[model samples]
Target: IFKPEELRQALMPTLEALYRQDPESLPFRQPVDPQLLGIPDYFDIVKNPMDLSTIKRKLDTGQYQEPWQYVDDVWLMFNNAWLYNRKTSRVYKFCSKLAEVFEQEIDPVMQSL
Candidate 1:
């Protein structure tokens, strides 16, 4: 039951570690390109081509069910944090879709099940 804020806080240390590991890496070196990253709509924008419907469908179907499946949530939160700092639309959309799907579908199911 990790909220977006909680996830962001948890990811800070790992992100710092990653940056420390390779400061010249993709994220650290060049600035994020918004065109490739897409826009930051939070959980809005329903018909996004990068929507998380697929993941939600898979989870709802109970085909590959597991608590760990929600790990994607963490990934999304981290993505958003990076996007927030870097302004990269690519990561923004990626994280937005992941967060939207997890929050809208996956989290609810996990709680009920």
Candidate 2:
């Protein structure tokens, strides 16, 4: 079994790499601000909003007991975008690429555990 610190050490870079993939920093880097984005229905649609920044905080604070929990949040962030945005929307397009890249990046990390 991996010690907590060891797991964090491995996970941090993976999280950072995922964030780096999002160049525009629109949806993944930070939480969605429906008020600022002028999408009032966002919160209602995405009941469990997630983001990389929030996931990093949670991991740093030891909120993740296992790697899959961290992975879940990452997926949730993308999944929320898919749920709320149209397939042709820029957000959806960005998330699709990000999600694919994340899967490629994360598999090795998950295998290490």
Candidate 3:
């Protein structure tokens, strides 16, 4: 297991490197600078100490957040990093139906063995 910040710290640079290598890639092309890291927007939004204070509070005690909640940033960032890599188009069709693939494709083949 890895700490969220630790995983994030490591993942960002790798994302940047991939872009540096392939300027034509989706991430390297637009919306952000060519060097933009595939980090979740929330981590960047949680820059203020006051904001992190809330997250830390959530950490110290087991509780849901105050009110505003969105999709999972950590999970999104981790997956986005991979999704923006060199394989999105190759896997796009199967991407949305991951569980089904394991059931329809993998499990069917797997049970035979």
Q: For each candidate, C-alpha RMSD in Å?
A: 13.4, 1.4, 13.4
Better of 1 and 2 by TM-score: 2
Per model, state how many residue pairs clash: 3, 0, 0
TM-scores, all models, native as reference = 0.29, 0.91, 0.23
For model 2 the TM-score comes to 0.91
Better of 1 and 3 by lDDT: 1
RMSD of 3: 13.4
Candidate 1 structure quality by residue, lDDT tens digits, 51-96:
1333333334553334554355345434545545445555444444
Model 1: per-residue Cα lDDT at residue 41: 59
Task: Go through the candidates in order and give each one's C-alpha lDDT.
Answer: 0.40, 0.84, 0.33
Candidate 1: Cα lDDT at 66: 42
lDDT of 2: 0.84
Worst 10 residues of 2 by lDDT: 18-27
Per-residue lDDT over 1-113 for candidate 2, one digit per residue giving the tens place of the 0 to 100 score: 66778889988988777778746345678889989989899888999999878998998887888898888988889899899999998889889888877877888888888
Which of the numbered candidates is closest to the native, going by highest TM-score? 2
TM-score (C-alpha, index-matched) for candidate 3: 0.23
